[PDB]
């Protein structure tokens, strides 16, 4: 034993678990474009060239991605940003009129994807109305009931809720976004590339802000994500639990190259004073229908690689893939936004065939909507105005969302199907390395020092 006395040390490096409201910071001068963006704020201005990093030697910290406090923070942040940008834009209440619709004829042909609908709309003066027409490029307009006439239709908003236009000024972009914790709190990061989603991480480092996480929204396939470092990684709460969601990270990306080859023309409709409704007026080119292409060679390799990796957890069971079981149009088809158009791709062959994992051009037909019950799944309706001209897309698929069919299958087989519908599981695949811990500069610790005798000054020890 030894004689020891109390000593205070405010300034110490020790932290505790906590949750905090995190400030956003955007990469480069994108904050100067961010003023005109949604999914990006108005605007996330940085102050220093973030993110800097330091490796903390000999530090082991316990991580968990499924109880993560940041994924709930951003999901309630993005949807709140979604409402604010859409709030001042024109509402589509006056368009709910008995639409008279017929076949949409085009130059020496007809298009099966849409209907030519005409309706009475109010002019500048409220007591006079005019005939008007527009090609609502979807047959997703409910026929009006209580009549034998098959040529009266109605816009699907008004059965449940009126909707708001997405103003042409704002742009839907996945700009990279960094989360910067405030002073007093520090964001950790787990560098262990073999991290399966929970448990200790023995290679920790601290950063000012998170990496350039971009707010992409899609279903059944994760686009423009951050890839795994070494190999394919599979992450789930408990693989034996057939519920939950199996998030896969791809070693390298398969490029999804696709487009909307029709040449559409935007038309302005004058529904009210200072309020303009934009609709596809006519087609000024040959029709070829939307579709998407994926490399058959590279994708088929991905299922072979992923199959054996799953089989490590499910020993001696051949992995089978299959089409989605059911749900809305938003989760039974690979859905995403690209260039202002909302695609819903059938996955014509991104499901098929047995794949043992032991080694013993795919074209997707895609439908398009204008009205979207947005990917939050319950809330705001939005009308996406048409984008004139062709659209083209070139995106890196980086992860797959899957789910499993239980439980009395043949013991040598197991069936996997796509999943989706919840925004958080898209972002939980990128925001999984981090924690937020409050720094607590600690106090007492005994030392060889002695008491402060009659207030006399002392420095050394």
């Amino acid at each position: 034993a030894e004689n020891l006395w109390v000593t205070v040390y405010y300034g110490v490096p020790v932290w505790k678990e906590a949750k905090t409201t995190l400030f956003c910071a955007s990469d480069a001068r994108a904050y100067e474009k961010e003023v005109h963006n949604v999914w990006a704020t108005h605007a996330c201005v940085p102050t220093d060239p973030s993110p800097q990093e330091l490796v903390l030697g000999n530090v082991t910290e316990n991580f968990n991605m499924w109880k993560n406090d940041m994924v709930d923070q951003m999901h309630e942040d993005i949807i709140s940003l979604w409402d604010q940008s859409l709030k001042p834009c024109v509402k589509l209440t006056p368009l709910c009129v008995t639409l008279i619709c017929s076949n949409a004829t085009v130059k020496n042909g007809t298009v099966e994807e849409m209907k030519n609908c005409s309706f009475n709309t109010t002019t500048e003066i409220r007591d006079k109305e005019k005939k008007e027409y527009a090609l609502f490029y979807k047959p997703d307009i409910v026929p009006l009931s209580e009549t034998n006439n098959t040529s009266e239709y109605r816009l699907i908003n008004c059965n449940t809720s009126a909707c708001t236009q997405a103003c042409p000024k704002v742009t839907f972009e996945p700009i990279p976004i960094h989360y910067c914790a405030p002073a007093g709190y520090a964001i950790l990061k787990c560098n262990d590339e073999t991290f399966n989603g929970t448990g200790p991480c023995s290679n920790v480092s601290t950063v000012q802000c998170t990496h350039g996480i971009r707010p992409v929204v899609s279903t059944q396939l994760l686009l423009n994500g951050s890839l795994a470092e070494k190999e394919i990684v599979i992450r789930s709460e408990n693989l034996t639990n057939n519920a939950k969601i199996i998030i896969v990270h791809l070693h390298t990306p398969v490029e999804i190259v696709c487009t909307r080859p029709n040449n559409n023309t935007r038309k302005s409709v004058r529904i009210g004073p200072g309020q303009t409704f934009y609709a596809t007026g006519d087609i000024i080119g040959d029709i070829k229908q939307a579709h998407c292409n994926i490399s058959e060679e590279k994708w088929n390799d991905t299922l072979q690689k992923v199959g054996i990796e799953l089989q490590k957890h499910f020993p001696n069971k051949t992995i089978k893939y299959n089409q989605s079981a059911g749900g809305d149009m938003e989760i039974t088809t690979h859905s995403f936004n690209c260039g202002g158009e909302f695609f819903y791709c059938n996955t014509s062959n991104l499901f098929n065939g047995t794949y043992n994992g032991t080694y013993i051009t795919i074209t997707l037909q895609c439908r398009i909507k204008q009205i979207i019950n947005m990917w939050q799944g319950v809330g705001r309706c939005m009308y996406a105005p048409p984008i004139a001209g062709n659209i083209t897309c070139r995106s890196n698929i980086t992860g797959l969302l899957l789910t499993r069919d239980g439980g009395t299958n043949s013991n040598e087989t197991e069936t996997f199907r796509p999943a989706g519908g919840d925004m958080r599981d898209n972002w939980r695949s990128e925001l999984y390395k981090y924690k937020v811990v409050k720094i607590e500069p600690l106090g007492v610790a005994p030392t060889r020092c002695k008491r402060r005798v009659v207030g006399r000054r002392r420095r050394r020890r």
Binding site: A1, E2, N3, L4, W5, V6, T7, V8, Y9, Y10, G11, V12, P13, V14, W15, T20, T21, L22, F23, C24, A25, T41, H42, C44, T47, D48, Q52, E53, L54, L56, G57, N58, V59, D77, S80, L81, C180, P182, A183, G184, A186, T206, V207, Q208, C209, I439, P441, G443, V444, A445, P446, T447, R448, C449, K450, R451, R452, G455, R458, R461
Partner: protein, 136 residues
């Protein structure tokens, strides 16, 4: 690490190092806790929500130093004898091994109790702030 120019992400490797090495460069944390890296929208209100709490936590820490008699000092001795019940009386041998991140787990229950003694320690001095000596 030893050094004080450094960066806040220049010294925190001491989070694993010994308490002795962590005891130096104790000022860089005190610098970082102040401000750090921080139409109306979400981030605008967040800059008022987070900023005010960052200031609020700093005042609560300097509030305790200003009472215990350790005002303005990073290190500070106090007139309290270390009770062996809180920990064994041989930490002088041990803190070359433990890091501060590991020391906190030992005094987790006793920290709020110890602050009473440090308050009592000042009030061995405060009881002596009325009686005799300072006729000068």
């Amino acid at each position: 690490a030893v050094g004080i120019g450094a960066v806040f992400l220049g010294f925190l490797g001491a989070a694993g190092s010994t308490m002795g090495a962590a005891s130096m460069t104790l000022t860089v944390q005190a610098r970082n806790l102040l401000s750090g890296i921080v139409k109306l929208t979400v981030w605008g209100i967040k800059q008022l929500q987070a900023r005010v709490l960052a200031v609020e936590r700093y005042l609560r820490d300097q509030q305790l130093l200003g009472i215990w008699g350790c005002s303005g000092k990073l290190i500070c001795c106090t007139n309290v004898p270390w009770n062996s019940s809180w920990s064994n009386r041989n930490l002088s041998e041990i803190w070359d091994n433990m890091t501060w991140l590991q020391w906190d787990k030992e005094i987790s229950n006793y920290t709020q109790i110890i602050y009473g003694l440090l308050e009592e320690s000042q009030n061995q001095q405060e009881k002596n702030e009325q009686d005799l000596l300072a006729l000068d």
